[PDB]
């Protein structure tokens, strides 16, 4: 169903990654 | 972050509940268990207001209102938008208030001072409880309570009061009003009197306690004395609500006629009627 509605994924996901990576 | 004299007083212990884990200051605020709890309500309760107000019809700060449920719902839960959120907030409210009051108790324990402050703060809490809880219980609906809304709440006060035909005559009110006035006047005098003694104008020397006394014993011929004014202030303040609470609870559960009609008891003593 999530079709070009990646909006919540983008919001939730992106930080999730750089939170992982910045503070290694 | 500290007053020059603050450190010697910042010691552990004297929490009512859950010891050391919450015993700390964030900046100047002392937290404690109830700190945490307060915050939680404040945050949740306020957020809840906002969300609720968002699905209102305005965002003018005066004009926003969260009303309680219709009378048909009784003492039960209502749909969230048809009075439920009201219910929600009211609990967060109580929540916050009580957590506030207990926090104060913890603080005062830590300082080895009396508990007068918290207790004093208990009076308004009670009146809140009287208006939002008891009186509605006694009439059997939440719909008898007042709505949250700056101007909105006054509308409640207004109509309520015209439900008995002229609330001014309700004797509980009379007493409360009198106190309200005396209190204000008295604060003025107490305020002034200290200030006059301290800042006597020019390079005049600061005056003594005897000068406070003389001053009043001149103007009105009595001086209540220094400690007791403090004591008396607390008393006046407090009966604003203590006496009023009587008049409030009475109206509806114990009286259903206009308030003036009630003075009939005196007006109508058959001797001089």
């Amino acid at each position: 169903s999530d079709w070009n509605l990646w909006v919540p994924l983008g919001i939730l996901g992106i930080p999730t990654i750089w939170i992982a990576l910045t503070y290694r | 972050a500290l007053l020059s004299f603050e450190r010697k007083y910042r010691v552990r212990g004297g929490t009512l509940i859950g010891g050391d884990l919450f015993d700390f200051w964030v900046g100047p605020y002392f937290v404690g268990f109830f700190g945490v709890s307060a915050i939680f309500f404040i945050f949740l309760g306020v957020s809840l207001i906002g969300y609720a107000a968002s699905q209102g019809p305005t965002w003018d700060p005066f004009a926003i209102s969260i009303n309680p449920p219709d009378l048909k719902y009784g003492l039960g839960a209502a749909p969230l938008l048809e009075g439920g959120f009201w219910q929600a907030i009211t609990v967060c409210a109580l929540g916050a208030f009580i957590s506030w009051m207990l926090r104060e108790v913890e603080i005062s324990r830590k300082l080895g001072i009396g508990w007068h402050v918290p207790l004093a703060f208990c009076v308004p809490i009670f009146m809140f409880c009287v208006l939002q809880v008891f009186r509605p219980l006694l009439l059997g609906s939440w719909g008898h309570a007042f709505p949250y809304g700056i101007l909105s709440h006054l509308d409640w006060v207004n109509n309520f009061g015209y439900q008995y035909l002229n609330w001014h005559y309700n004797p509980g009110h009379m007493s409360s009003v009198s106190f309200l006035f005396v209190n204000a006047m008295a604060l003025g005098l107490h305020g002034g009197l200290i200030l006059s003694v301290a800042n006597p104008g020019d390079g005049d020397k600061v005056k003594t306690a005897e000068h406070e006394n003389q001053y009043f014993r001149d103007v009105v011929g009595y001086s209540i004395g220094a400690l007791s004014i403090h004591r008396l202030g607390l008393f006046l303040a407090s009966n604003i609500f203590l006496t009023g609470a009587f008049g409030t609870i009475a109206s509806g559960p114990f009286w259903t006629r206009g308030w003036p009609e009630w003075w009939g008891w005196w007006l109508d003593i058959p001797f001089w009627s």
Binding site: - | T58, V117, L151, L180, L195, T208, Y215, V219, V220, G233
Partner: protein
């Protein structure tokens, strides 16, 4: 409990010391006596009293006023003494009921009202002077006088100034227990609901404020009375553990504090402001706003509610309405 904050357990008696004034040490009047019961809440000793000129005058005008008031109240029950005493709260001295604008109204309709008004005004003033002078006599500051001032001014506003700006004596407050109160409602109805006037707001804010503040200050001092914090003046000049605690307490709670001295300022300020806020509102009313609710609606402050029972169009405005 700690009994020593609520009432006084062991009372003291002894020689009271008189502070000699700048003048009028001579015009102190009466044998000072004690009340043991009163001694349980405050000082027991009740005399003497200063007299002097301002006093004399205040009493002079004050009494005349009272006399005119009462006398006319009697005249309302036709001097039946029994009835007077039964009906007393319902009796009053009323301002003029016809429209005469600002002309000095006939005796029987508002004339007497006006006279008592003027005399009450004069006593207030004479008294003001008393308060102010006595202060200066004893080398104190004049703060009490100024607070008192504002109060008086507000009385002026509702007594004659407002009537004046709209230009009718009909708008005066009447003398009498119930009837001074009936005024309140009338006045509010007329100016389109006072809950909706902003200065009524302000005022109340400050008034409740006073409640809060006194309760708090009151409670605070008692809480620290064990360290002799009731000795408020020495605390100002030589800060002791008492007020150190008091300060800390408040700081740890609302996150900022006062001083023993400055808390008094706050209280004094709030007190004043009740009266001032009020005066403004009164002055604006009738003069610039005609109907406070409608005004709040023009600035969209007013809350609007849906209809519970069906909405009702005003019958006056229908086709074929009477009058």
């Amino acid at each position: 409990a700690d009994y020593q904050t609520i009432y006084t357990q062991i009372q003291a008696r002894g020689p009271h010391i008189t502070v000699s004034g700048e003048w009028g040490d001579n015009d102190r009047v009466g044998k000072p006596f004690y009340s043991y019961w009163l001694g349980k809440i405050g000082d027991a000793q009740i005399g003497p009293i200063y007299l002097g000129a301002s006093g004399i005058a205040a009493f002079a005008f004050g009494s005349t006023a009272i006399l005119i008031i009462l006398f006319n109240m009697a005249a309302e029950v036709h001097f039946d003494p029994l009835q007077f005493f039964r009906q007393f709260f319902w009796l009053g001295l009323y301002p003029p009921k016809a429209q005469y604008g600002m002309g000095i109204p006939p005796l029987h309709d508002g004339g007497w009202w006006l006279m008592a008004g003027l005399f009450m005004t004069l006593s207030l003033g004479s008294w003001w002077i008393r308060v102010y002078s006595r202060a200066r006599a004893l080398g104190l500051g004049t703060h009490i006088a100024w607070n008192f001032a504002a109060a008086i001014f507000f009385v002026l506003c509702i007594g004659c100034i407002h009537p004046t700006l709209v230009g009718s004596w009909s708008e005066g407050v009447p003398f009498g227990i119930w009837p001074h109160i009936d005024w309140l409602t009338a006045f509010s109805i007329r100016y389109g609901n006072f809950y909706y006037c902003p200065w009524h707001g302000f005022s109340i804010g400050f008034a409740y404020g006073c409640g809060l503040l006194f309760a708090a200050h009151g409670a605070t001092i008692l809480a620290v009375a064990r360290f002799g914090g009731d000795r408020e003046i020495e605390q100002i000049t030589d800060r002791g553990t008492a007020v150190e605690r008091a300060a800390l307490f408040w700081r740890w709670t609302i996150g900022f504090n006062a001083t023993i001295e400055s808390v008094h300022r706050w209280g004094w300020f709030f007190s004043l402001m009740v009266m001032v806020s009020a005066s403004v509102g009164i002055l604006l009313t009738g003069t610039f706003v005609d109907n406070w609710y409608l005004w709040c609606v023009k600035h969209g402050a007013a809350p609007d509610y849906p209809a519970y029972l069906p909405a009702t169009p005003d019958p006056a405005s229908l086709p074929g309405a009477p009058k």
